Curated annotation (Swiss-Prot), chains A, B, C, D, E:
Name of this protein: Ferritin light chain
Gene Ontology cellular-component terms listed: autolysosome; autophagosome; cytoplasm; cytoplasmic vesicle; ferritin complex
Gene that produces this protein: FTL
Function: Stores iron in a soluble, non-toxic, readily available form. Important for iron homeostasis. Iron is taken up in the ferrous form and deposited as ferric hydroxides after oxidation. Also plays a role in delivery of iron to cells. Mediates iron uptake in capsule cells of the developing kidney. Delivery to lysosomes by the cargo receptor NCOA4 for autophagic degradation and release or iron.
A GO term, aspect molecular function: ferric iron binding
Length: 172, 172, 172, 172, 172
């Protein structure tokens, strides 16, 4: 290094883990994105929603890696586990799986902020705030909104509701 | 001629047949296009979808004919059989008939490419690639997507789903 | 006069009657237009569709009156009977009543053309062609298209279909 | 239907026949268009002249089909016979065959107008006037002009005249 | 090298030969181009037609050489034989010699594609397709068209036809 200052080995390690988490989340969204582009699923707006998220999670991993280098920490990459599912069911199933995924990332961010606080590392605490914490809260709110609307559309005709939600809410 | 080189009589004949196939497909789509413009059918977006395809298949026949002349082959036209139906039923029925039609054209293209390969005619093989093969794959994918969405909309209220699909997917 | 030439008293009288018919049709559409603007009916697109027709039928009467003066005939106005209904029921009911109304105007136009032919009055025959006959055919076709779509939307949930048709077909 | 008014079964049938005629004429011009693009014929302006006509005749069939639906008639398609020739000889031969073809279409239009008159169908009579009758007269006049100029160029050197006509009159 | 992969010595050698062929063809067209600029020949459009081809064949050799380096093959240049003639006779003679030349290049391209296929070298097969095969087919078609028109103009007055072709087809 030569630059490292007030940056604990504990935070460095947690940041590398959080990179793996974000990359895993990107991979999961990549899978979701292609599943909804299958000719037997064919929900364009849902596919684009998840493809967009795959890109956001990748960008989050890259921002963490840049920060790791800015602090004099060292990136360490691990094997990326495949997503939990090969097929993702309905839009409802997928949005449920998405909120749980996001909740898990948010909790990892909270655990890291807690560690930053315990380690008296305010640069970390700020970094997470501006790039990650508020973004997660806004995203989880949106998914909750979507889940509520998906659920109101289930009714007795599930196909009709799945079509209308994709057409009228997720418009490409 | 004076220009013909490496262009077998077998390929020349197959190209003339494929022209007839494409023209037949154009005629079929012309019929479909007008059927959905009937006052007792009246699905504007479906009519435009098939009218657009009638034009594409005609253009495909014309490109084959131009290629036939470029190679020194001779166009031979045959009687064009009328479409298989006078009335085409629902949007679902029509999209089903469309995919089968496209599959039959795609298989004719594949048979011709195979013949090109057996005849060692790379100009042919390339021509088909760029103008026909990838276009068919994209088109069949789209029709599969449409079929999936049509089918999800059938539910218990078929009229409602047929209206919504035309309004929200085929928007003119 | 001083200008009247080849213009029979029979045609002059029929033209005055046709003016009354067109004005009556305008009045009927005026009533329809306001009925769909009632707070307990409230179908904006349907209201605008009929208001637009009230204006078209008025313009048709004015064109006939201008022609009457161009030929040296004399406008004679009669009492305008009120519309056949005070309340018009559903969009379906109204579109049914509209097509019958239009059919009755079209038949009056046909009867007048027949009279023009019997009276050897080609200026009349042409006038009706360009301003009235083709317009009626296009309009009746459109109403037939609408009726078909309204009817497909009735299903088991009439309110839903009436709302969707107004929102998605009659968009203001 | 629900819209059909003053539209006889005789006219409906004649319109379907006239569609077949126009489509046949389009096919004939398509054949002519490609024949003049053969490397051993190679008269660019003549090819474009006939290709342009193939498109015009197709558009004429489509306008008739649209009108058939506007009146509440039902399109019925028949097998399209191949053109009368596989090879078309000289520009002269082709222009001679073109005028006869056009004369045959014009006579079909005249027969249909006569039927419209006998059936007291002024909408038909007008439709044919504006879209077909005057167009045929202008086109036949042009072909007559071309035939006269082709014939003056035959002389003792037929190749020279055929080249000059294509270069100087049919300029692409 | 360090980059060479799936690139046989047989293909490398054939590519070097094809470079020599293309350069020879450029030289031949250079000779043709200047012959038609002689004060006692003086056919401007014919000169420009061949000068343009000299440049195209040179560009083809350069594209092959670039590809040879892209694959890790090594350019080897050989003595360039002078053209088969010092004087080229009529436009007809020259266009005849041009088509034979082009046919010989096309056959070399076909032989190389065949070799690519036997050597399982798809990058080669594609390269030839896009840059060479379709270009040759279009060019040979054009020369066939020209030959047909030249021949129709010979008549009984060869000078007149040679002048008219240069003026009216090869316009600079
Ligand atoms: Pd999409
Ligand atoms: Pd999309
Ligand atoms: Pd439409
Ligand atoms: Pd439309
Ligand atoms: Pd309104
Ligand atoms: Pd409104
Ligand atoms: Pd051309
Ligand atoms: Pd041209
Ligand atoms: Pd020059
Ligand atoms: Pd010059």
């Amino acid at each position: 290094s030569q630059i490292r200052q007030n940056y604990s080995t504990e935070v460095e390690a947690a940041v590398n883990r959080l990179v793996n988490l974000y990359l895993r989340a990107s991979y999961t969204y990549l899978s979701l994105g292609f599943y909804f582009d299958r000719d037997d699923v064919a929900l364009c707006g849902v596919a684009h929603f998840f493809r967009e998220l795959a890109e956001e999670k990748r960008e989050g991993a890259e921002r963490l890696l840049k920060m790791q280098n800015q602090r004099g920490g060292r990136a360490l990459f691990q094997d990326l586990q495949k997503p939990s599912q090969d097929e993702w069911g309905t839009t409802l199933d997928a949005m449920k799986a998405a909120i749980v995924l996001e909740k898990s990332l948010n909790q990892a961010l909270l655990d890291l902020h807690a560690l930053g606080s315990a380690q008296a590392d305010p640069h970390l605490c700020d970094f997470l705030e501006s790039h990650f914490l508020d973004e997660e809260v806004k995203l989880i709110k949106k998914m909750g909104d979507h889940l509520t609307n998906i659920q109101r559309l289930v009714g007795s005709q599930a196909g009709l509701g799945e079509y209308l939600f994709e057409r009228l809410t997720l418009k490409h």
